[PDB]
């Protein structure tokens, strides 16, 4: 038995999400963790000590924003656990991680520890039935419907190019520099 898989598209600055078979990523939010700077005094204030999502944007002046994924490499695994749980929270997907396959996206030429720790997270914390980490160039080719092309993307923290001709990728002509939007 299998269900509709979840496309947890990562990003160094914006993390997209949404179920498969859709046409619009219905749940997009910035990939940052906001925790309060000031001191809570009143009784009936905001509660949680960690704010991710549109709530963080709603209270930017109260939170100390910090990005956990720098240049495509996850720097804070605990914060990423919070972010992925927020993806499966009751505000973005309202589902369980044990009932859906995950299509995670990674930038090319990433360190192996990112893939291994992502595997341990999605298979030890989230009890996901199936995970498939894919690239980012091939996906844009799928989105445009083409079969050939030089995907030149530029995320928030990684700009890279992966030339693909007739559905075949060339793993030696992949350039990648850590100079982008952020």
């Amino acid at each position: 038995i299998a269900n509709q898989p979840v496309v947890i598209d990562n990003g160094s600055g914006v993390i997209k999400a949404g179920f498969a078979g859709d046409q619009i990523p219905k749940y997009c939010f910035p990939n940052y963790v906001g925790r309060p700077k000031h001191v809570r005094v009143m009784a009936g204030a905001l509660e949680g000590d960690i704010f991710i999502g549109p709530k963080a944007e709603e209270h930017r002046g109260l939170l100390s924003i910090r990005y956990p994924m720098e240049h495509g490499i996850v720097k804070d695994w605990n914060d990423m656990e919070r972010i992925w749980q927020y993806v499966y929270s009751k505000d973005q997907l309202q589902t369980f991680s044990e009932e859906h396959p995950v299509l995670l996206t990674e930038a090319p030429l990433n360190p192996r520890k990112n893939r291994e720790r992502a595997a341990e997270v999605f298979f030890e914390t989230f009890n996901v039935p199936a995970l498939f980490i894919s690239m980012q160039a091939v996906l844009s080719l799928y989105a445009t419907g083409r079969t050939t092309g030089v995907v030149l993307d530029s995320g928030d923290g990684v700009t890279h190019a992966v030339p693909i001709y007739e559905g075949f990728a060339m793993p030696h002509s992949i350039m990648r520099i850590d100079i982008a939007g952020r």
Binding site: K37, V39, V41
Partner: protein, 75 residues
């Protein structure tokens, strides 16, 4: 009463009381502020079920951690 007969100078026809005729906010209605009617019942019902966790807090000038944010938990 008997102080009239026994004493010489205690006169009568004396008006004992000589007197006179006993003759017989707008700052809250401003257009600048928005006057609010305080209701303790509505406010009490609003903050009725909001807890405050005071587990290991501080407010003094103690510098051991990075920051200091008291009143952590709730309900």
């Amino acid at each position: 009463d008997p102080k009239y007969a026994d004493l010489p100078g205690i006169a009568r026809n004396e008006p004992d009381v000589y007197e006179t005729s006993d003759l017989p906010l707008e700052e809250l209605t401003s257009t600048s502020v928005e006057h609010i009617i305080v209701n303790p019942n509505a406010a009490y019902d609003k903050f009725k079920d909001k807890r405050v966790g005071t587990k290991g807090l501080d407010f003094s000038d103690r510098i051991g951690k990075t920051k200091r944010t008291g009143y952590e938990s709730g309900e």
